[PDB]
Design a protein around this ligand. Sequence first.
Ligand SMILES: [Cl-]
Lengths: 123, 123, 123, 104, 103, 103, 97, 103, 104, 103, 103, 123, 123
Amino acid sequence: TPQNITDLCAEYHNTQIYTLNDKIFSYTESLAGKREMAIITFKNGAIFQVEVPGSQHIDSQKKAIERMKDTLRIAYLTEAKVEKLCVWNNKTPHAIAAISMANGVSALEKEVSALKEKVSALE
Amino acid sequence: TPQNITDLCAEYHNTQIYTLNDKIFSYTESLAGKREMAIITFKNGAIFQVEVPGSQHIDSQKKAIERMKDTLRIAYLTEAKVEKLCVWNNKTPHAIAAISMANGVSALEKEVSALKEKVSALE
Amino acid sequence: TPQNITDLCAEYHNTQIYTLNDKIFSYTESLAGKREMAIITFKNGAIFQVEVPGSQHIDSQKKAIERMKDTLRIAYLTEAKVEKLCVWNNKTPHAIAAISMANGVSALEKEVSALKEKVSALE
Amino acid sequence: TPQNITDLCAEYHNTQIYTLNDKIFSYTESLAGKREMAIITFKNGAIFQVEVPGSQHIDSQKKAIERMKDTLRIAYLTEAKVEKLCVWNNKTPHAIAAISMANG
Amino acid sequence: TPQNITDLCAEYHNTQIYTLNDKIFSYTESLAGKREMAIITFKNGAIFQVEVPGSQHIDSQKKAIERMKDTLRIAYLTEAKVEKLCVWNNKTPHAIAAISMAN
Amino acid sequence: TPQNITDLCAEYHNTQIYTLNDKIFSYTESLAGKREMAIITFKNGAIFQVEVPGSQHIDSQKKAIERMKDTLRIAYLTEAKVEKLCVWNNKTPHAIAAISMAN
Amino acid sequence: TPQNITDLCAEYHNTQIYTLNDKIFSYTESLAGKREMAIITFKNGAIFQVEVPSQKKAIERMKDTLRIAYLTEAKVEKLCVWNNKTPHAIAAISMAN
Amino acid sequence: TPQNITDLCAEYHNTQIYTLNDKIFSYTESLAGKREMAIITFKNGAIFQVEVPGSQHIDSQKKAIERMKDTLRIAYLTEAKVEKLCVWNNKTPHAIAAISMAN
Amino acid sequence: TPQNITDLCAEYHNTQIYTLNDKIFSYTESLAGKREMAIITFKNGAIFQVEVPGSQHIDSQKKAIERMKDTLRIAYLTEAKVEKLCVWNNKTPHAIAAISMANG
Amino acid sequence: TPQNITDLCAEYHNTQIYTLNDKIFSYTESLAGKREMAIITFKNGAIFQVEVPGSQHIDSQKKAIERMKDTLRIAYLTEAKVEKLCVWNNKTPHAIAAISMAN
Amino acid sequence: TPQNITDLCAEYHNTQIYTLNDKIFSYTESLAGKREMAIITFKNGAIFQVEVPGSQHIDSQKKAIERMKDTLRIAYLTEAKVEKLCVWNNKTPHAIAAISMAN
Amino acid sequence: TPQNITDLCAEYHNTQIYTLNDKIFSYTESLAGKREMAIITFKNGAIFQVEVPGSQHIDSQKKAIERMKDTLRIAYLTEAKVEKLCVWNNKTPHAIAAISMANGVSALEKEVSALKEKVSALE
Amino acid sequence: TPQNITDLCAEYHNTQIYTLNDKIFSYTESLAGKREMAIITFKNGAIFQVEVPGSQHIDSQKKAIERMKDTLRIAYLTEAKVEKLCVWNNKTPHAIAAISMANGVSALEKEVSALKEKVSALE
Ligand SMILES: [Cl-]
């Protein structure tokens, strides 16, 4: 069994890791017939789907597909940073296989936390 | 597969995009027999339903109809801005097919606007 | 005539903008028969090709395909920041149609550099 | 034969000199069909193209169009000051006919 | 289409990946008749050629052979780290099919 | 065969050597029809062209004219000292036949 | 196929290796009719040409190599040259750092 | 199906509504090869085109492009107020997709 | 053959007469792909379309759809009173099948 | 060739002249399948159609039917006095074959 | 190419100019089979036809014949002064080849 | 893409702009074989044709030639001011490539209308 | 036949356009043997000759050379703005082939600027 998303991703053909360290920019969901799907975007222009169940999914994946859509919705609404996505790159948009969330404090976010410690000390 | 709500909407007859860029004003839900439905309103007076599950829905849409009602409820309670709705305009109220939510608000841009108000007051 | 890479990208089917504001992480080039191509990667995991010249290219594109590979090589070797790529998302890896380079100090990054000059002068 | 970019510019209809005395802010290039072009910008908001080769170019200009795009790319990457551009003002963006680089 | 040099290399017979993670030690180029070739070496003693264009090359490779020699020359002069070479191990020196450069 | 630019220059009519021992002050290039040319200037006011390729050039000179414009551009951008220019003084501006660069 | 410039040079009759281990002192190029040539010199006093013209491309490449070597001050290790020409004519160049 | 120009505009990428509530200031039309186009201007300086028919148009649009030019000409000649234009903002001038007239 | 718009309307399923006795308040027309349509409104808030030509139209209707859009545009520009519209009420907006204009 | 509408009308079976010397009271047009027609009325109660085009009408008459509908619409909108109609009396309503307008 | 209607008319056999300097008194149009024609009259009693399209017309004339009928109808309805008609005098009524309108 | 008739005109050989700011004086149209053309004149003596369709026209121009004749007829009948014509000067009469209409004769006419409002107020 | 000085200039070898948009600063004329010539200067330091009639002139040019000297003299004496000179740059001073003079700033536009200065002072 793999111990992280990168090792998990390497067990499948036609997959790659995207490292975003960013919150979701947009969340789209459809109940329309044959398009019961979710789409997320990031500021950098990356677009990802959770595929419509049917075609190419085994029974054990049905619950995990529904869980992924719940995860993306609550991540979007809480502005949770997505660390990595494992995706299938043979689909358009690229299709989510796995997600990691970690709070990796952004580049100028350490200089904004330090001008909030120096700004709440002077005035 | 479509990459966004506008392309998704164009795959169906009797649909249109409403651009709201606003949070939901009201959320209504019913468990009454033959009216197991949700209704949302916006400040501008727009009214939308999630239809009662019925003969016009295929089996794959049952879970997506339940998910849409979960999405609208948590969006209402968190005051999330709705960007667009794709709706069937041959129903009254217009019936939701898809929803997009977009997060404009720049994360550390609210802490940079607040250390520009605290920095142009002390020194 | 388009005025920028975003307008240029919108003139084609199956394209999207990626905003990277990052230097190229890796540059790969092949002279092997039927794989006369280049591949670039970014730290974020994004992979892009310049396609093998083929039946989907018109004669006008031949010189521009060779120019794009020259541009990517010199950009890699000088660590030039890539601002945007316009790519075809119906290819795997996504295929480069256009590139913009600007050394763009970010929006709130100019107000963070100015509250680091005003903050290292008071205390 | 003209001795400088200003005299060269005056030999063509629908041209004007822009004096920038600034390095290129952005360099854009496309291999997309019918948009095999370059676009440069300056900090001041000025936008210029090297046109797609077309029916308004004579055969002798094909190599010079390719050379101009090489020049703009290496100028961008070395932060060379552009002194002047001679451009066609009947195109949007204005289309580069000539470039001078001086002592920046 | 492959996504990296290792997958590209595996599509051909008689090829292998060398991982160098090192800059080029020497660049040699010849204009002598029937030896219009380039040779690079690494500190570890590894020697690689860009083959003389010949009957084993298809027309689409002609420009890519010239590009490879340009790439090796500018890589040598800028001391760029070569990550991997895909080479034909059927030739002596081994003949370059592909190069990857990574920081 | 001549061994330096001065001996090379003396093989042609209407040529002279200018000794600059200075980097190029300005580089101008045109893609305008019938003016596909380059112009360089020096601080001392000297102006030189690479002529538009034309009926006064033989086929072997076409590539050398393109090479000269590449050389002048990279010389300008690297601030390389130009030692001497061999030019045709029959043309206005004087037209470059050869360039020497020494540190 | 030879593996270095010295073995390559030994495959031809009129050739010799010069070992310079020095950067190029001067670069000269001409576009004049029948003298489309390059001349390089070393501090040592050594003078070499790329002669006036698939060897067509290699002649053009050699002149590109000598120009960028001159401008980057790259050390030239060895030249293989034809000694039946004056100046001696470049057949091959090796650069080692 | 949309019920108004604003909803219609939202069904396309790279579009926006301009509200003019003004008559057309100028009408320009061309029969020249590869420029078979119309341009309208408003007093406020806004410029809009009906694009040359091209590869970005499907067959069903050919008649509608001709109708739009008829509509703009009769609107200009009758001084009809244009309420809104839906336009593609990735073109210069911005390219008309739809027009509404009220009042 | 029917002698008036009301009798014509009664020959089709899913149609109804609207009596407006009013000029058109707004005229909207689109050349966008798959939305090659017209929309008219009246002061009372009523909205009507000329449908995109499609699989529900027979060949003879192509010309009549183009004629209807010409009629609505010239009616709007001349402020002609529309007497009645025959429309399909199974479309949103309701889709025009016929128009009458009466001078008195 | 006849020189007026009355002589033209007399060349056909099942036709007659109506003299109206009045503008059109109502203009009706339909795009409904198999009813692609126009109906005009006069204050005196006279009703006339432009017949549905079809495949059993000669090609020259299909174009003239389209012209007649354009003529009736612009006549209605300008309140032009209709002098005479030539109509086929074997159709109900009587079907327009020709129209004359005098001031 | 002629510069006015009088020079145009003189290029054909069997033509003459009528100078009317008057608006059209009557406009007649027919969709009856083999009489798809227009007839105009002037107050002075002059009668002119646009001929039925037929074997004496070349393909380039088809659109121009339809344009002439559009021109005569809009001229009649706007009371535009007709300056001159170029007509074929070997037809009865005389057949319109060209029209000029001036003021 | 050009932005106005003057830029459009400069894209062609053998063309020039005439600025008329005047209504059409005469409209002539012919259906005679090989002279299926229109001729307009202005009071100043300028004569212009819409050329007979021929071998010098590409297929895309056919509809635009018919449109130009419609435009000239309705312009004549409404007395619309023609601002500019782009014409080919290698034809006799000069042949129309483009027309602009604007209701101007403004420029110093707006400062003459304002010194007639200031002059009928003082004396 | 060319339509302007720029097209005329492009028909000759060793010519260039100078744009002066200025009146002539000096006029010099000589009747001395073998120097029967004119020289004009501009404030910017530009010097131009009308060449001595000679073996490089065809018979047709004799009258035009005399006319050019008449034109330059009357232009000098009336302070007429010279727009452009087409000159041979293989002669010292550069030798005049053609001259353009352009007007612009309108006749009654100087009396409209003066009844706007007299009208915004009284009433
Ligand atoms: Cl005859």
